[PDB]
DNA sequence: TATATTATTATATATTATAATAT
DNA sequence: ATATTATAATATATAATAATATA
């Protein structure tokens, strides 16, 4: 977990996603070693 | 097991349109880069989704098929964009009914695949993979002018003429193993408003007629008896269509009344009313639209042997 | 002991539609295959499930009579599909009321009888037995264009022809044991309201009349006595409708009207009027409905010798 | 003879209602036939349940005069189903105010006198004896038209003219044993706002007031005393109605203007005005709120006799 | 109870009752070795 | 759970069935590590 | 690389408007202030977004842009004005579509560049930093005259002649870097319609023939096969304009016609046609504007090859 | 929950914003040691 | 522990709105 | 050049359910 993950959660919430599933998608594929846009991409690929 | 065509020359109709789109295809092949974003405008019945698939295969790219009414929130758009990758394409239809925030999201996403919406805190810098969004709506007047101007490829999809529709019927019967008389092919092509989806549906109905009432392949006589049994004249009339014609020429004297009134009289939708009427009414010149109403021409009245008072 | 035509061949009232459905029955039986998807729509209440049972009798295979609330989830309809077998059928209603997730679940189900489902993402493909998918709604216009385009046969339903209505009245009177007159049957067919159920109610009430006023006898003059003692007009007007006409040409004198003022002056609920008396005459088209106030058409003006602005 | 009269000739209601479906049902009874379904509807407070109970008692059949909103559960519905026997009759009040389960358990009863109950589990076939349901609703527009197909008879109610009101008040005063003049009956009918059952209630109240200050005879000075006491004269103008119309003529004087404005002028809730005050004068030619606004005829001005061109 | 009374009780909860009142309705007017319809009919007037 | 069992449970969850009843129907009728389509068929053979 | 114009020297447009905005910028810089609220009513987008970018480039500040219908709430406008820093540039297109409360809040912005709001009601006094409002709308005719009266700077725009196409060929094709013939550019201007957007499309689409075919021949049909159908007699117009001329000549006889009648004949928005096709077609002398009807000039008759009525 | 907070909410109500949106905006920013006008200004500068 | 005390998910229904028109 | 108001959406008071400190 880092500031990129919390920023991803907040951006998905402000986009309109439900906070619990947005947080689950963020935590499933975190950007610990990669950018926030890439882990947001991988999370958004999670629920297709 | 489908008879859906998947070839560029399969939709040989609208040859200038097909040639221009072939030019765009060879352009994208020569570009080896991002395509210009596309908004094709065309009424249904023409296999426009099939056309999008065919040009997607000619790109050698995977195609995902959906529509504007399906989407309701730009997060769904972002999910679809993430599912797409480099060398992909997304079939989108009826983009006019869509949330605007999707449109301001997609403005940088069609500028340079970018997304810089706000999360204060850190905003996203989502530069998507290289893939070009395309649109295959019906009418672009109801589409927004900025989206109409910003999208590169625009084209009209039109109903096919009798020769191409008859050729399509012949080749589909070839896929079906069936044999069609050229005169029967001509009459079914000049019927059904010259639209390949409806032409194929009519081909299925006529081949079912030849399976039941006929004892072999379809000739002009067999096809004509099928159309008479289905009550299909040379104008390709439907019973509901004939009913609307009778109401407009008799109850309303040409029908100079709005589409709402006639649609409620049928108890049917406005969009259903128009997408039935215009592709054959306009091409036959039997009604024009006035602010008073879609009043019929003198040609429609004199079609049924009725003299203009 | 409700009304039922035992076979589609035995069905009367829409003889042309009877001919095409006989064509379809022979198409399924002669090809020995599952019949195409046939789209059914027309009047809202007509015993469509009974018609599906007749079609089931014609095939000889069962049809699971299901509806929108019956199939509100994809799970139970998928369960029924698993319980379905080769050459079966499944009646579905309120498809417009059904969720789009149901629609995407049934996309491979009628797309050559398959099934696709997902599970880090994984794909699971399933097959389905071949059957005849049945789609019947009160109004087919709410259906999405790609699904109805992917669908095959479409069948319109309507109230019978006036000759057909009189024939059905004669058949029901023979069922009811009434000594009807063909002139009286034509009278009832003129007053048929577009509703066979309410028409049969009228046969019951005039049977009561001929029991109590006639000597158990039905003639044209007996029918005229019954439908002069009641709300009668050969179009279908009532003294409800006559009162509405008198007020409409009397209060605002053939102009657009305020619905609140209509309810206050008329002393009936406006919802009752627009649900009962208005929709039939809108189907008759004798009014036009405007967003600033409903105005009757020229039929009311000629009905009482009135001028046109 | 009671608070509510019993014989049909006691309550000379609408002459069409009094003529049709009374002698007819009196002749049709005893034919070993269970009667079909029937609606009476109209303005509230008119004792339509009393009329149905009357109809049952000249039918001489056991009746359970019930209220629908009391019987919300299917269990008490089935209890009333097993309460009666073959060819009997049931009375329900305000059927349109019910939970849907009521209607989808009475649908098989309407169909084939059938009590289909559910408990793989399987529903159980439970027949019912032949019966009759009569409908007693204020408004049945919100009632579903499957029910409107199931119910075979509808009867409307309307404001009563002064002759029927005078006959009703004279008969009910003879029931009450009064010495009212025919001019007394006319003045009571004029003071009352129609509504013959509520008019009977008003007659009972006026009889109590007259017995408080005198004998059972009714004199024009006593009628004036009652009109001033109830603040409603023979013109039917309420005190609030008279004050508001005086306010309207004091400023706009028949000027067609908007409602919000007059409501703010009167400092009264406009929706309460809508559902109480102007409908009563709107059944007559008094109030004509236009697209321009309120219009009041000089017939209402004749209460004080001042009018302008 | 018997299968007929059990199916009756199941229908009673299936239309909105609760099991103990269905039980005392069955016990108040028990049915003997016949088809379910008749004594459920006297039960439904017996519950009045 | 096996791969076919887990895929069937996820499929019935996506179909709208509750995960508990989906798992019970999937593990009740068929055998062990059989073809996913037919054991999904057998799990959805159940009715109420 | 951005092919769009960055500096005012890079800008291509009306020389008169260019000198006018040059002297406005010089007057603003001589006062050591940003440019005041300049009103630019004319073609939306064409020379307006570019003009706002020119103002941002000359002032060297960040720019924020929005639209008229986007700002539904005055609070959003106050939020963005508070977010706007000192001297920043604001671009709002379709300024005539603001709700009047938005304009009431906006009036102190071009009064004294402060939030001097006029509003149980508290006058909020927010520190509003000075900013430049690029007032963009279709015309000043429908503008509210407090707003048009309060604008310190007023100017116009017009559709450009062939000089802008020539300057585009000089500049952006050099930015493109690919060879374009001068007479080839002149024959490209046969369809460029004097539009920078159409010129950008043509610059993107001349390369299409270059990448399909490596020989690189340049002929007139080679330049036309990018849009292979001529869609015009000469000089700019398209298939939509061809349909417009066909419905003026064949249907409306090229004479007077109701504006809504012609709009419903086109089956398109009157405002869209009047903003896009009407002013340019009037500029080349094909239509004169008359209130009694939209009559076409001599060019429409002579280009069609028919006599002038 | 504060006098300055209530003044900001009333000002945003008079400016056209909803009371619920005004409460959300004044709770979105931790305006401390600031005047009401400048706290409103930085709140407008906050999210955007 | 089970119970009053907080969360949070629909559903009509009294609102807001527009157009087109007399005036 | 005002209003008005006849049809069209809309947003929340009132129904519900799910944790949670506490005698």
Same domain, D144 and D276: no
**What is the spatial distance between Cα G102 and Cα G71, in angstroms, rounded to a whole number?**
8
Which residue, of G188, G206, G227, is where some domain finishes? G227
Both D27 and D117 in one domain: the answer is yes
Spatial distance between the Cα atoms of G242 and G304, rounded to a whole number of angstroms: 10
Name beta bridge partners: D38.
D134, D153
Question: In Å, how far is A16's CA from the nearest CA of chain C?
Answer: 21
Give the position of tokens 């079914």: B188
Q: Do G94 and G207 sit in the same domain of this protein? A: no
Q: Find out whether G242 is annotated in a ligand binding site.
A: no
Q: How far is B95 from chain A (nearest CA, A)?
A: 20
Q: Which of the other chains make 3 or more beta carbon contacts under 8 angstroms with chain A?
A: B, C
Neighbour tally for C232: CB within 10 Å: 18
* Residue G144 vs residues G99, G119, G148, G150, G155: alpha-carbon distances, Å: 11, 20, 6, 10, 16
In the sheet where C88-92 sits, what is the strand order? C63-65, C88-92, C131-136, C38-41, C153-156
Task: Specify whether C244 is located in the same domain as C112.
Answer: no
Residue of G192, G195, G224 whose CA lies nearest to G209: G224
Give whole-number Cα distances, G120 to C58, G15, G117, H11, in Å.
Answer: 76, 52, 15, 10
Of G82, G121, G127, the CB nearest to H14: G121
Residue C3 maps to a domain: no
Strand partners of residue C90: C64, C133
Residue B4 lies in a domain: no
Calculate the CA G211 to chain-centre distance.
Answer: 32
Whether the beta carbon of C306 falls within 7 A of nucleic chain J: the reply is no
DSSP secondary structure of chain D: --SS--STTTS---HHHHHTTTHHHHHHTTSS-----EEEE-STTS-HHHHHHHHHHHHT----EEETTT--SHHHHHHHHHHS-TT--EEEE-GGGS-HHHHHHHHHHHHHSB--B------B--B-----EEEEES--SSS-HHHHHH--EEE---PPPHHHHHHHHHHHHHHHT-EE-HHHHHHHHHHTTS-HHHHHHHHHHHHHHHHHHS-SEE-HHHHHHHHHHHT--TT---HHHHHHHHHHHHHTSS----HHHHHHHHTS-HHHHHHHHHHHHHTTTSB---SS---B-HHHHTTTT----
Q: Is B260 helix (H, G, I), strand (E, B) or coil?
A: helix
- Answer for C292: CB within 7 Å of strand I: yes
Distance in angstroms (rounded) separating the CA atoms of residues C61 and D118: 25
Residue D255: CB less than 7 A from any atom in strand I: no
Give the CATH number, domain containing residue D180: 1.10.8.60
B179 lies in the same domain as B251: no
3-class secondary-structure state, position C88: strand
Q: Are strands D153-155 and D38-41 parallel, antiparallel or unpaired?
A: parallel
For C307, counting Cβ atoms within 10 Å of its Cβ (0-12 exposed, 13-18 middle, 19+ buried), the class is exposed
Min CA distance, B83 vs chain A (Å)? 5
> Residue D116, annotated ligand binder?
no
Residues from G contacting H (CB-CB < 8 Å) are: 73-76, 78-80, 82-83, 101, 105, 117, 119, 121-122, 124-127
Q: Is B297 a catalytic residue?
A: no
Structure tokens at B57: 């295969």
Closest chain D CA to residue E37: D126
Contacts of B118 in chain H (CB under 8 A): 47-48
Residues G21 and G150 in one domain: yes
| Strand I bases within 7 angstroms of protein beta carbons | 14-15, 19-23
B170 and B290 part of one domain = no
Question: What is the domain range of residue D172?
Answer: 162-230
Closest CB to B73 among A16, A37, A48: A16
Distance CA B167, CA B185 (A): 8
Taking the CA of residue G225 and the C1' sugar atom of nucleotide I15, their distance in angstroms comes to 58
Given a contact cutoff of 8 angstroms between Cβ atoms, the answer to whether H46 and B120 are in contact is: yes
Contact between chains at G211 and B290 (C-beta distance less than 8 A): no
With DSSP H G I counted as helix, E B as strand and the rest as coil, what are the percentages for chain C, rounded to 5? 50, 10, 40
Residues β-bridged to residue C33: none
Residue F48 DSSP label: -
Nucleotide of closest approach to D292 (CA, C1'): J4
Task: Please provide the size of chain E in residues.
Answer: 48
Residue of E3, E8, E14 best to disrupt the D interface, most CBs of D under 10 A: E14
Quick one: how many helices (H) and strands (E) in chain H? 3, 0
Which is nearest to C27 in space by CA: C152, C113, C135? Answer: C152
Please count the structural domains in chain C.
3
Task: Please indicate, yes or no, if residue B2 is contained in any of the structural domains.
Answer: no
Q: How far is the CA of H27 from the C1' of I4 (A)?
A: 30
Are B26 and G260 in contact (CB < 8 Å)? Answer: no
Please check if D113 is assigned to a binding site.
yes
**Residue G260 CA to J23 C1' — how many Å?**
78
Alpha-carbon distance of C206 to B130, in angstroms, equals 76
Distance from CA of H29 to the nearest CA of G (A): 14
Q: Which residues on chain C are in Cβ contact (under 8 Å) with D94?
A: none
Contact assessment for residue B93 and residue B67, using Cβ atoms and an 8 Å cutoff: yes
- φ and ψ at residue C91, rounded to 5 degrees: -75, 130
Q: Report DSSP letters for chain G, one per residue.
A: ---S--STTT--S-HHHHHHHHHHHHHHHHTTS----EEEESSSSTTTHHHHHHHHHHHT--EEEEETTT--SHHHHHHHHHHS-TTEEEEEE-GGGS-HHHHHHHHHHHHHSS----------------EEEEEEES-SSSS-HHHHHH-SEEEE-----HHHHHHHHHHHHHHH-----HHHHHHHHHHHTT-HHHHHHHHHHHHHHHHH-SS----HHHHHGGG-S--SSSSS--HHHHHHHHIIIIITTTS---HHHHHHHHTS-HHHHHHHHHHHHHHTTSEEEETTEEEE-HHHHHHTTS---
**Distance between CA atoms of G165 and G202, rounded to whole angstroms?**
11
Q: Write the CA distances from F11 to C124, D144, E18, G214, H24, integer angstroms.
A: 8, 38, 35, 53, 40
Which residues, at least 6 apart from B115, have a Cβ–Cβ distance to it below 8 Å?
B78, B105, B108, B109, B124, B125, B126, B127, B128
List the single best residue of H6, H14, H15 to mutate versus G (max G Cβ within 10 A): H15
Taking the C-alpha atoms of residue C212 and residue D28, their distance in angstroms, rounded to an integer, is 6
Our measurement of CA H32 to C1' J4, in angstroms, reads 49
State the pairing for strand pair G88-93/G131-137: parallel
Domains of chain F: 3-43 (1.10.8.10)
Q: Where is the domain boundary, G127, G156, G185?
A: G156
Does D11 carry a binding-site annotation?
Answer: no
Please, which contacts does D108-112 make with residues 24 or more away whose CB atoms are closer than 8 Å? D109/D81, D110/D37, D110/D147, D110/D150, D111/C2, D111/D150, D112/C1, D112/C2
Quote the minimal CA–CA distance from D82 to chain E in Å.
Answer: 6
**Residue G197 labeled ligand binder:** yes
Provide the β-strand partners of residue G66: G92
B217 in catalytic set:
no
Residues of chain A contacting residue B82, judged by C-beta atoms under 8 Å apart: 40-42, 44-45
Chain F residues with CB under 8 Å of C105 CB are 15
What are the distances in angstroms from CA C36 to CA B180, C7, C134, C136, G55? 22, 19, 9, 14, 65
Tell me the CATH number at D283: 1.10.10.10
Cβ neighbours of C285 (radius 10 Å): 20
**Burial letters C214-227, b for 16+ CB under 10 A, else e:** beeebeeebbebbb
Residue pair C173/C205 in contact by the 8 Å Cβ criterion: no
CA D114 to chain centre: 32
d(CA B294, CA B254): 8
Please, do chains C and B touch (3+ CB pairs < 8 Å)? Answer: yes
CB-CB under 8 Å, C100 with B70 = yes
D35 burial (CB, 10 Å; 0-12 / 13-18 / 19+) is buried
- Closest CA relative to residue G236, chosen from G286, G289, G305, G274: G286
CB C54 within 8 A of CB C38: no
Nearest residue to B113 via CA among B49, B223, B15, B35: B35
Kindly determine whether residue E48 and residue D83, on different chains, have CB atoms separated by under 8 Å.
Answer: yes
B64 in Cβ contact with B90 (< 8 Å) = yes
φ, ψ for residue B198 (rounded to 5)?
Answer: -70, -30
Is the Cβ pair B118, H46 closer than 8 Å?
no
**How far is the C-alpha of B188 from the C-alpha of B167, rounded, in Å?**
11
Helices first, then strands: H and E counts in chain C: 14, 9
Give the pair of three-digit tokens for residue C281: 């005459």
**Cβ of C261 near strand J (distance < 7 A):** yes
Domain assignment present for residue D308? The answer is no
What DSSP designation does B235 have? T
Q: Searching chain C, which residue's CA lies closest to the CA of residue D31?
A: C211
Cα distance between residue G170 and residue G55, in whole Å: 24
Residue C1 in any domain: the answer is no
Rg (CA), chain F: 9
Q: D129 phi and psi, to 5 degrees?
A: -65, 155
Pairing state between β G63-67 and G153-156:
unpaired
Structural contact between residues C192 and C167, judged by C-beta atoms closer than 8 angstroms? no
Name residues 212-251 of chain D with a Cβ under 7 Å from nucleic strand I.
none
Instruction: Tell me which method was used to determine the 3D structure.
Output: cryo-EM
Query: Which residues on neighbouring strands pair with residue B154, listed in sequence order?
Result: B39
- B272 found inside a domain: yes
Q: Which residues of chain G lie closer than 8 angstroms to B149, CB-CB? A: 45, 197
Give the nucleotide nearest to D262 (CA→C1'). J4
Find the closest chain G residue to B111 by CA distance.
Answer: G2
Active site residues of C: 48-49, 93, 138, 197
The residues, ordered by sequence, that sit 6+ positions from B32 with a Cβ below 8 Å of its Cβ are: none
Measuring from the CA of residue C291 to each C1', which nucleotide is nearest? J7
The residue in chain B having the minimum alpha-carbon distance to the alpha carbon of residue C24 is B208
Q: How far apart are CA C262 and CA C288, in angstroms?
A: 16
CA dist B309 and B297 (Å) reads 13
Which residue out of D49, D132, D137, D195 is catalytically annotated?
D49
My answer on whether B150 and B31 are in the same domain is: yes
Shortest-distance nucleotide from H18 CA to C1': J11
| Residue reference for tokens 């939970």 | D99
Q: Do G123 and G26 share a structural domain?
A: yes
What is residue A7's three-state secondary structure?
A: helix
Asked if the structure places residue B134 within a domain, the reply is yes
CA–C1' span, G146 to J1, in Å? Answer: 16
d(CA C266, CA C269): 8
Q: Give helix then strand counts, H and E, for chain A.
A: 3, 0
Contact present, G78 and H15 (Cβ < 8 Å): yes
Residues followed by a break in chain B, C–N over 2.5 Å? 119
Asked if residue D290 belongs to a known ligand binding site, the reply is no
Size of interface B-G (CB pairs under 8 A): 55
The residue from G10, G49, G243, G275 that is catalytic is G49
Q: Are residues C68 and C127 in the same domain?
A: yes
Instruction: State the resolution, in angstroms.
Output: 7.0
Q: Which of B95, B130, B156 corresponds to the end of one domain? A: B156
Q: Do B122 and B261 belong to one domain?
A: no
Q: Which helix (H) or strand (E) holds B150?
A: helix B145-150
Q: Is residue D220 part of a domain?
A: yes
Interchain CB distance below 8 Å, C126 and F12: no
Which residues are paired to D114 by β-bridges? D127
DSSP-assigned letters across all residues of F15-44:
TT--HHHHHHHHHHSS-SS--HHHHHHHHT
Strand I proximity: list residues 72-101 of D with CB under 7 Å: none
Beta-strand relationship, G293-296 and D153-155? unpaired
Place of tokens 């409620």: B264
Backbone angles phi, psi at B98, to 5 degrees: -160, 150
Q: What is d(CA B286, CA B304) in angstroms, rounded to the nearest whole number?
A: 12
**Strand J within 7 Å of which CB atoms in D 249-278?**
256-261
Specify whether G47 is located in the same domain as G142. yes
User: Measured between alpha carbons, how far is C181 from C104 in angstroms, rounded to an integer?
Assistant: 54
Supply the angle between the helices C15-31 and B220-229 in degrees, to the nearest 10. 130
């Amino acid at each position: 977990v880092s500031s990129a993950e919390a920023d991803a959660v907040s951006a998905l919430i402000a986009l309109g996603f439900k906070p619990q599933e947005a947080s689950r998608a963020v935590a499933a594929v975190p950007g610990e070693d990669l950018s926030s846009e890439e882990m947001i991409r991988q999370a958004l690929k999670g629920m297709v | 097991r489908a008879i859906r065509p998947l070839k560029l020359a399969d939709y040989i109709g609208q040859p200038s349109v097909r040639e221009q789109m072939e030019l765009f295809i060879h352009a994208a092949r020569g570009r080896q880069e991002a395509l210009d974003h596309t908004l094709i405008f065309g009424p249904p019945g023409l296999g426009k989704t099939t056309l999008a698939n065919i040009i997607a295969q000619e790109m050698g790219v995977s195609i995902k098929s959906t529509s504007g009414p399906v989407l309701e929130r730009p997060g769904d758009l972002a999910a679809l964009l993430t599912n797409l990758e480099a060398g992909d394409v997304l079939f989108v239809d009826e983009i006019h009914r869509l949330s605007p925030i999707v449109e301001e999201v997609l403005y940088p996403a069609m500028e340079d695949f970018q997304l810089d919406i706000m999360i204060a805190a850190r905003s996203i810098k989502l530069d998507l993979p290289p893939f070009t969004l395309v649109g295959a709506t019906t009418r672009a007047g109801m589409l927004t002018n900025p989206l109409r101007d910003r999208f590169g490829i625009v084209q009209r999809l039109e109903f096919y003429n009798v020769e191409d529709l008859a050729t399509i019927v012949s080749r589909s019967a070839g896929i079906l193993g069936l044999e069609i008389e050229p005169q029967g092919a001509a009459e079914i092509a000049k019927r059904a408003r010259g639209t390949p989806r409806i032409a194929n549906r009519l081909l299925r109905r006529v081949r079912d007629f030849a399976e039941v009432r006929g004892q072999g392949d379809i000739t002009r006589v067999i096809a004509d008896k099928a159309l008479n049994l289905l009550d299909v004249d040379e104008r390709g009339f439907d019973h509901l269509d004939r009913r609307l014609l009778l109401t407009m020429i008799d109850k309303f004297d040409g029908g100079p009344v709005g589409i709402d009134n006639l649609a409620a009289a049928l108890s049917e939708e406005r969009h259903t009313i128009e997408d039935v009427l215009e592709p054959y009414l306009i091409q036959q010149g039997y009604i024009m639209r006035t602010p008073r109403g879609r009043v019929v021409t003198r040609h429609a009245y004199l079609h049924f042997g009725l003299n203009i008072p």
